[PDB]
Each structure stands twice: as C-alpha cells, then as structure tokens.
C-alpha cells in the first residue's frame, strides 16, 4: 500500500542519496546493485526501485 | 507545473542602487560566456534580466 512517492531532486539544491539499485548498464559501466550505496543529483530524474 | 509565484522584475541603474547576484545551481547561463561556479556578480546600469 503506497499512495504518495516520487523520484525528484529539486534542482541541484536539496538533493538525495540511496542504497544502490543498478538494473540497466551501458558499455562503459556494469555495477554492483545490492552491495554498494549511491549518491544522486538533479541530472537523474529516472523512477524508483524495490531494494 | 510546480514551484511558482509572481515576481515583479525589479530594476535599478547607476549610483541609484546595486545587485549582489550569486549562482544557486548555475554555472554559465548568460550572454558573453560561461561562469565558473556558484560565484557572485555585480549589476550597474539600465535594464534588469531573468
């Protein structure tokens, strides 16, 4: 049961971090998803994950 | 549409007053070239801006 949730980093200010959830990977970087912990900026308005 | 209000585009020119701008999340947004960081500018003369 989840009513309100988001994936917004209000400009560069007030930004957020996370427990990593790396599902898609480019030809440059393939990363550990539930072993590492991550940091986030505005340049990432991609949606949410489970873990 | 989010994070909005009604700003009256304030103006000033010469000895009159001055504008102590900074860059909250900005690096290079204005005409001549490209600012280095979240640093600060002065504003003296005729018209205002964004």
């Amino acid at each position: 049961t989840v009513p309100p949730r988001h994936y917004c980093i209000v400009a560069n200010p007030v930004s957020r971090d996370t427990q990593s959830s790396v599902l898609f990977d480019i030809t440059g970087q393939v990363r550990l998803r539930h072993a590492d912990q991550e940091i986030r900026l505005a340049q990432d308005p991609f949606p949410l994950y489970p873990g | 549409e989010v994070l909005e209000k009604d700003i009256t585009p304030l103006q000033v020119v010469l000895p009159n007053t001055a504008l102590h701008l900074k860059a909250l999340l900005d690096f290079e947004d204005k005409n001549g070239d490209k600012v280095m960081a979240g640093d600060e500018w002065l504003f003296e003369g005729p018209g205002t801006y964004i």
Side-chain angles (χ1 to χ4, degrees):
Chain A
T1 168
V2 192
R5 272 243 210 160
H6 40 64
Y7 47 87
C8 297
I9 351 77
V10 43
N12 202 99
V14 260
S15 42
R16 306 200 80 144
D17 77 281
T18 196
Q19 131 85 262
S20 67
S21 299
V22 198
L23 224 84
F24 111 90
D25 281 305
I26 59 190
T27 191
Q29 292 160 337
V30 57
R31 328 166 195 167
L32 15 146
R33 111 170 272 238
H34 283 116
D36 217 37
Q37 190 154 306
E38 277 177 12
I39 55 78
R40 308 187 168 194
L41 293 172
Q43 54 211 29
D44 212 284
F46 297 84
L48 306 73
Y49 273 108
Chain B
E1 303 168 306
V2 93
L3 288 145
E4 80 280 311
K5 259 98 201 163
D6 40 324
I7 59 190
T8 94
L10 289 154
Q11 294 226 14
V12 281
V13 40
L14 291 166
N16 161 41
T17 336
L19 285 160
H20 210 318
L21 72 89
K22 97 176 96 156
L24 186 77
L25 49 278
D26 196 65
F27 282 60
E28 68 184 42
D29 95 75
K30 234 68 205 279
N31 304 128
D33 215 287
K34 304 143 96 282
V35 182
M36 224 253 273
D39 49 294
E40 311 191 320
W41 288 85
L42 45 57
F43 205 31
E44 286 284 39
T48 194
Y49 60 118
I50 39 81

